[PDB]
C-alpha cells in the first residue's frame, strides 16, 4: 500500500587514480529503475526497469544533465570536505546522499527525506519540517551556511512536495503490474540433525516482493528472539527476495516450535511446523 522513491548518490575520490567517481541510482520501493555512472565509457542515465523505458528523450537528457552537473559539484564538495577536516590529499573519501519521498496507502506525501554522509558518518540532514538542517559537526555547519545562502531547503521542500510525489505516482501507474503487485513468500521448514540430541529447524521464505517480511520462531507460543539465527533478507536476482530463520531444538521437541510468516502478499499470516 505505502510507496517510496529514493535516489542514492555515491561520490568517491581516488587520489592518483583519476577524478572522483559519481554514481547515482534511483529506486521505487525495492525496485531500481535508473543508473548513472561517471566512469561509464559514455556517461548517460540508463533504464534499469522495463516500465521506465517508455520515457521520452527529453526525460533521459534532463536526467543526464542533472547527473553530469552533480558529477562536477561532488568533485568540488569532496575537495571542500577534505579541507574542512584538515585531511591529507593522499586518502580516498566518500560523500553519500539519499533523498526522496514517502507516500501513504492513499498516495499522499507522508514525509520527505534528504541526508548526506561523509566516510559513512552522518554529515548533514534535512529535518522532517523540510525547512531546517541538522549538521553533525563544525565542518557540516559550513555546508549548512552555504546551503542556507543558496536556499537549498526551500528548493528541496518544493521538489519533495511536488515533482517527487508527482513522478513517483506516474512510475507507480506505469509499473503497476510489478510495483503494485505484492508476491507472497513460498515457505517450507527443513530439519537438519546437529547431534544425537539436537537438530536445526530452518524456516524458509522465497520469491517474495517487497523485501519487508517478518520471520519468527516460537516455542510453546513464545518468541525465540535470542535463540533464532536470522539471515539478512537477500535478493534472488529476479526482483524477489529470500530469507530464513533457524533454531537449534532438543531432539523430540520439534512440535513445540512454530514459524510465523507475515508479508503483504499473503491472504492471511502463516503458521508453519516441521512436517516429517
Amino acid at each position: 500500500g505505502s510507496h517510496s522513491m529514493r535516489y542514492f548518490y555515491t561520490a568517491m575520490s581516488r587520489p592518483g587514480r583519476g577524478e572522483p567517481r559519481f554514481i547515482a541510482v534511483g529506486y521505487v520501493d525495492d525496485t531500481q529503475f535508473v543508473r548513472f555512472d561517471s566512469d561509464a565509457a559514455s556517461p548517460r542515465t540508463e533504464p534499469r526497469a522495463p516500465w521506465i523505458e517508455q520515457e521520452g528523450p527529453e526525460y533521459w537528457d534532463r536526467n543526464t544533465q542533472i547527473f553530469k552537473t552533480n558529477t562536477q559539484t561532488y568533485r568540488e564538495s569532496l575537495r571542500n570536505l577534505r579541507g574542512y577536516y584538515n585531511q591529507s590529499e593522499a586518502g580516498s573519501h566518500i560523500i553519500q546522499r539519499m533523498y526522496g519521498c514517502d507516500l501513504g496507502p492513499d498516495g499522499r506525501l507522508l514525509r520527505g527525506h534528504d541526508q548526506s554522509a561523509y566516510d559513512g558518518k552522518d554529515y548533514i540532514a534535512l529535518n522532517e519540517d523540510l525547512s531546517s538542517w541538522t549538521a553533525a559537526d563544525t565542518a557540516a555547519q559550513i555546508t549548512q551556511r552555504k546551503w542556507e545562502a543558496a536556499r537549498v531547503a526551500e528548493q528541496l521542500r518544493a521538489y519533495l512536495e511536488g515533482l517527487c510525489v508527482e513522478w513517483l505516482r506516474r512510475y507507480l501507474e506505469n509499473g503497476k503490474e510489478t510495483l503494485q503487485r505484492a508476491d507472497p513468500p513460498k515457505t517450507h521448514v527443513t530439519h537438519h540433525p546437529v547431534s544425537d540430541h539436537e537438530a536445526t529447524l530452518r524456516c524458509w521464505a522465497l520469491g517474495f516482493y517487497p523485501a519487508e517480511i517478518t520471520l519468527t520462531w516460537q516455542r510453546d507460543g513464545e518468541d525465540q528472539t535470542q535463540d533464532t539465527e536470522l539471515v539478512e533478507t537477500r535478493p534472488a536476482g529476479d526482483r524477489t527476495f529470500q530469507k530464513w530463520a533457524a533454531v537449534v531444538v532438543p531432539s523430540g521437541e520439534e512440535q513445540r516450535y512454530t514459524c510465523h510468516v507475515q508479508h503483504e502478499g499473503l491472504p492471511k499470516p502463516l503458521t508453519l511446523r516441521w512436517e516429517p
Partner: peptide, 9 residues
C-alpha cells in the same frame, strides 16, 4: 525524477 539543483558543500 531526481532533484534538479546541485549545491557545492
Amino acid at each position: 525524477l531526481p532533484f534538479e539543483k546541485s549545491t557545492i558543500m
